[PDB]
UniProtKB/Swiss-Prot annotation, chains A, C, D:
Effect of residue 320 to P: In AAMR; drastically reduced protein expression; reduces allosteric inhibition of GMPPB; fails to rescue phenotype when expressed in a zebrafish disease model
Region of interest: Hexapeptide repeat domain: 259-406
Primary location group: cytoplasm
Species assigned in the record: Homo sapiens
Lineage, opening ranks: Eukaryota, Metazoa, Chordata, Craniata, Vertebrata
C-loop as annotated region, ranges: 342-370
Annotated gene: GMPPA
GO function term, MF aspect, one: enzyme binding
Mutation effect (residue 394 to E): Does not disrupt the interaction with GMPPB or other GMPPA molecules
Name assigned to this protein: Mannose-1-phosphate guanylyltransferase regulatory subunit alpha
Length: 406, 407, 406, 406
């Protein structure tokens, strides 16, 4: 038997995902219709031998997290527990702090997944490689562009034994095309270096990449497993859109009943579109590629929706165009209003993609990105929101362009 | 018997041109050490015969609002009540909706005061002009620059009798250089035209006071002006509040000489006018430049240079930091050798009586360089420059930011 | 042109409904399936000429109240406005304070409705009796039992013209057997006495019963309209149970699709039972008379449910017996656990009924009434909760009998 | 070098016997004027060598507990740290789970204190007994009656070497007069038997008294240090009033500036009375024995206060008699109002006897005990509140006797 540890963050790691995170926690943001960690729990309960799923984070258990945990426990036939760490303990410090609960029942190995990644999660093939080799650390790696790889944790390996010889968390200079994916397979022996790291701290917070992956690289403990299935990070509020698009593309294999079909008496559907059943979509509303509709969403007639997330309880009145946007919970977009953004994906194989920095401005100018509307934002009739971020509970009366509307 | 009505706004109507804060209500923001409406309440409770003080707004009753009401009631031994509207009723709709509460006790007159002004508040001078005149609407007006007069309520008066003949609220072309200060003396008959505006609509109860009652009743012998020479500013932006802080710390030299910070050469070096709370800990090596206001429980380390800044309560500035032109929010930490700097929004010093322009956070799609705002519980790391940035509340930074809005 | 003023209270009004008012406000408590005031709103929106519904209370407008407001505005196609008062102004002082908002549009008349009452709401009959004579106050009245009438507002009338000669709010002896129903029809002239009352307090708070009805009774202003329909007050937390019984009896005539039908496929039912469509009920559940089931309720195989109210998200495991109880939101009753109460209907006509005090204890013993479980109370297996009150978020381990579990 | 673990509870633990106060946590309740665990932190920081104080519990960190931690760190010049358990873990499971934080820095011994005890805390005496023999467990023992000891953990000791030969936690018939006090002194080897318990549950929650003390008794690890200082459990509200009395008696010998002297320009003061400096007490108020006033309390002219606690912000108007009560914070008692409770104190006929904790309900009947007025409870003028429990945010309007007013 095995178990999974999904490292969800806490409220400080959700600061970068801020317009969206004001209402829900970041790991519960619905990416292609289901919350962000439900893709992880989906992929982990698909593995034969999964006993437990242990979320580690420093979120307080509010109503949405505990209701999600009970819903995941019923839907996925597993005990899904939430281990709240007493302090922000870094990446590996919460795995070392909870080692008695992780190793309870003596699992053969355990997965360690970052909650902010979108992946196909090739957990079975990682397990095949681990049961072949039996090493302390198995990392998942992807190939990136040489220019984009500097935004990520670079891995220099040995292409015959697949041993990580070098690891650097964000190098200024080129190191390697292999980037860490935030998916790991630890054996129980892997909790013995972390102990050492913690003991060296006494002369509690352990960063897994800077203190364990970069230290034991080349000593025989850390190994790679490569893929090139889908992979994305979700850091800012608008990388949720790229993650949603990748997931809606892989629903063509894993859940094709989530994807909506045209059915000539209904709304006109291009590309991959998720529509929740509670949503009412008018038959003249064409829903373009990579759209996901939340529950309780009333989409009026003639509404064009392309490359967007419309969250729960939102309302798009007649003849609206919503492109590359995230319409928040309960937001209302009046008739002939245009909410337009600019596509900006992380995409580590795109040589023109931005670094996904925390600074949204270059020199006073807001860089063109996804248009985020917070919850309860009333966009008036006949008005354009272009490349803007609107903070929650803001009733607007005016056209806004390249602005953060506080 | 006189009473006072302070029109405080509400959660959406604040519309912060560049935010002073995010989590405390805008009337309770400390300008020159004390909350923005406590200057109004001091000025009103100094007036003899003033019985009651009413705050009309549509803020929900949170805890800071209630504890400020109790603190003001205890400090001035006046009733200070908060009449909350069922909706945003505009500038005159809350006066018409609460006219039985306003006119209970039968006052001789009532002062209507905008919450977001910094004023000398010559309430006895307006009171004496009105006791000589006995007119329905008396307005305090100042003198504006010709270019900047278009942002305020402009007044064509008659200079012999001091009667408003024409009123435009926010013009596009110049009509006058007299501007409405936002301070009014109302007779108990001034509620009688407000009713008329309501009955023009009912043929709910929103009445813009300046656009419906002042713009349309001018020239009819009903509105009169009282021209003043003292300090006056509008407090809308963050730089507008730093300017109001400078004006009020100037006026503290002859109203509250105990409130300013003297040198005390065992203690911190004081340049200019500085307010320090008695509970704040300021290390003796820290030099505190002009127009600095320190809240309660603020810890200031050694060698801290504070110049033209508001440091709200609970904030900790560690050693060797430089905070200039900033509003360090409550509970915010600035670590060693960090520099939190903003750009001053100073009036045009070549021109007579330029008041202030309030920056609108974006000029033409570009972010404007202005005051640096740190939100509540913002952590600035050691050895980091924050320049012209707004850091949203509860955000631990890790690098130097320049001309950002860090969410 | 008519409108309706529904006097919902505030939190101090709803403290008498304490186990259940921790979660939702009292007017939004679901009685026979829908919230308490949606009965009033639906019964006003069938009056020809009804143009506005105003809710006057001192509840702060949090998320559930404005969700209810928008949902009713869409469901009944009427403007449902909420008028929050600056201070708790009594029963009539909030009508006097909001007079310009009520008298807007020059309405012919307006119905004042207390939120706590359960009624058939005979609004058209009061309307016709008003249009025949046009008096300042029309009161709705019922005949009570001579013993029970001392607990209510008694109206001494003249039996010919039906004009009030006397009003006493809580009598000491028998004054009359006609009691005040909390349903009123006001002409626009009715605010001319209220103003007088307000001025008499200056040389704000106005009790409509004690300051307006007690004074103008016998002076030719107040008239009565006797009715025979179902009438109840919902003061205590378990008078909602008797109200839901009366409303589920009215549902046979007014909304017959809300009741459940005996079918081979699902559970078998005796008497009037409301089951929500999103509620999963097992076929071996026997849902006895006067039972309301909320959305998301799982009712296990073998559950006996009789004279109860189950609320949204609650779980009853197999073989449980729930009788005369109210099961709060998300509560869990484990298997073979029995949640029993004693019927305690307010019942003015009945001569046996309790006086409905705010006490609940007689001589140190909790008087036997409805067993209320609060929000998310977890009840273990094989345990008895008999005549008890469990405050919310309690995980019991024991049998409890005639207690309050704090 | 030593440190001190105080085992504060969590929200489910410690609310059952009676409610001292509904809103602030049980460890933050002011017993004799200062919070309940400030007596522990006082006694612990007064011990030479004490480097840290840890608070192990499962309360979520809110502004009361965080603000108290800041205040205590500032006052006592120690680091005072709250360690939140991820789950309720028992009285030994939190000690074992946070063993890397407790044993960090090499303490030579650490105290473990139950948060709900009144004691003089002879920590230097226990430390002198431990520095002379260096055993894994040192327990504080008191003597109890031969019918009260069934309610405590009983210790059969050796009269000469003071070694526990038997431990029983809640016996059914009489075992020993020596009872466990909830004050322990652990050596760093004492976290080695705890690990031995933990693995034996593998085939996290560790009870200290039932798994560690009761099963290692007689092997050479658990010893006793007998005393006869002040001692009490603080479980119910009568327990809190009595522990306030014991601490106010000890304030004569330790903090004599806390007790209130006469000051003939002030109130009349009988017995031991703590008054906060920020409180406002009229000169005509007679403050009887064992009263403690919180901060910002206005006390009117002619108030009688006897055997009572008045929390921060409460106003008692003129001529009120508050006897044997806890007036919660922000409460208001009107003119000529009586708030009375009945004390079921220690036996007058037995020297040995402790305080029995009543359990809110005995023999199906609500017991006459301390009157608890909750937070912002408004008691009207000329109203008697006898033996009642008024739940928070309640305005009453009449007299009540032997109730729980919801
Ligand atoms: N009760 C209530 N108060 C309000 C509302 N809206 C604004 N207020 C408060 O009423 C005052 C009026 O502000 P604004 O309506 O936003 O206009 P303004 O830009 O401040 O202009 C007014 O004051 C200027 C002086 O600074 C004048 O120049 C101008 O003529 C006008 O009087 C402010 O204190 C505002 O907070 C409302 O809907 N209800
Ligand atoms: N961290 C943590 N602390 C806890 C937990 N459970 C209880 N505590 C704290 O541990 C202390 C006592 O534990 P209890 O087990 O609830 O106490 P008791 O049954 O009433 O009796 C205890 O004290 C008596 C003397 O006061 C003793 O006789 C007895 O042996 C035991 O220590 C209290 O401060 C309680 O808040 C827990 O799960 N986790
Ligand atoms: N449980 C838990 N998870 C965390 C914590 N910190 C980070 N994580 C998770 O692990 C991922 C790592 O994020 P970061 O802490 O930013 O580290 P990084 O991805 O290597 O990038 P850098 O910021 O350059 O260090 C986060 O996206 C979270 O999913 C933590 O303190 N506790
Ligand atoms: N808006 C508003 N509504 C109120 C206020 N007080 C009561 N109400 C509502 O109006 C109705 C009258 O309340 P009650 O005074 O309790 O009715 P009652 O039957 O005369 O009195 P009791 O049953 O003895 O408590 C109730 O439905 C309340 O919800 C108030 O101050 N403001």
């Amino acid at each position: 038997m095995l178990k999974a540890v999904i490292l969800i963050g806490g409220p400080q790691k959700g600061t970068r995902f801020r317009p969206l995170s004001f209402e829900v926690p970041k790991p519960l943001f619905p990416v292609a219709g289901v919350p962000m960690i439900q893709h992880h729990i989906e992929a982990c309960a698909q593995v034969p031998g999964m006993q437990e799923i242990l979320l580690i984070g420093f979120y307080q258990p509010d109503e949405p997290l505990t209701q999600f945990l009970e819903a995941a426990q019923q839907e996925f036939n597993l005990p899904v527990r939430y281990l709240q760490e007493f302090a922000p303990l870094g990446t590996g410090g919460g795995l070392y702090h909870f080692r008695d609960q992780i190793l309870a029942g003596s699992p053969e190995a355990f997965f360690v997944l970052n909650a902010d990644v979108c992946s196909d999660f090739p957990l079975s093939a990682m397990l095949e490689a681990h049961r072949r080799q039996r090493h302390p650390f198995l990392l998942l790696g992807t190939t990136a562009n040489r220019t984009q790889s500097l935004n990520y944790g670079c891995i220099v390996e040995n292409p015959q034994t697949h041993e990580v010889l070098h690891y650097v968390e964000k190098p200024s200079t080129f190191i390697s095309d292999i980037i860490n994916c935030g998916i790991y397979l630890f054996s129980p022996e892997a909790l013995k270096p972390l102990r050492d790291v913690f003991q060296r701290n006494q002369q509690g917070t352990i960063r897994l990449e800077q203190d364990v992956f970069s230290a034991l690289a080349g000593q025989g403990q850390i190994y790679v497993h490569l893929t090139d299935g889908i992979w994305s990070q979700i850091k800012s509020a608008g990388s949720a859109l790229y993650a949603s698009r990748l997931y809606l593309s892989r629903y063509q294999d894993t859940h094709p009943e989530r994807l909506a079909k045209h059915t000539p008496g209904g709304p006109w559907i291009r590309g991959n579109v998720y529509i929740h059943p509670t949503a009412k979509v008018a038959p003249s509303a064409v829903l373009g590629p990579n759209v996901s509709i939340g529950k309780g969403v009333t989409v009026g007639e003639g509404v064009r929706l392309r490359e967007s997330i419309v969250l729960h309880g939102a309302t798009l009145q007649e003849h609206t165009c919503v492109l590359h946007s995230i319409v928040g919970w309960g937001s209302t977009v009046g008739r002939w209003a245009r909410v337009e953004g600019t596509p900006s994906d992380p995409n580590p194989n795109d040589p023109r993609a931005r670094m996904d920095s925390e600074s949204l401005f270059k020199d006073g100018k807001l860089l063109p990105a996804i248009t985020i509307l917070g919850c309860r934002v009333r966009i008036p009739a006949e008005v354009l929101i272009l490349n803007s971020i609107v903070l929650p509970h803001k009733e607007l009366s005016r056209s806004f362009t390249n602005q953060i509307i506080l």
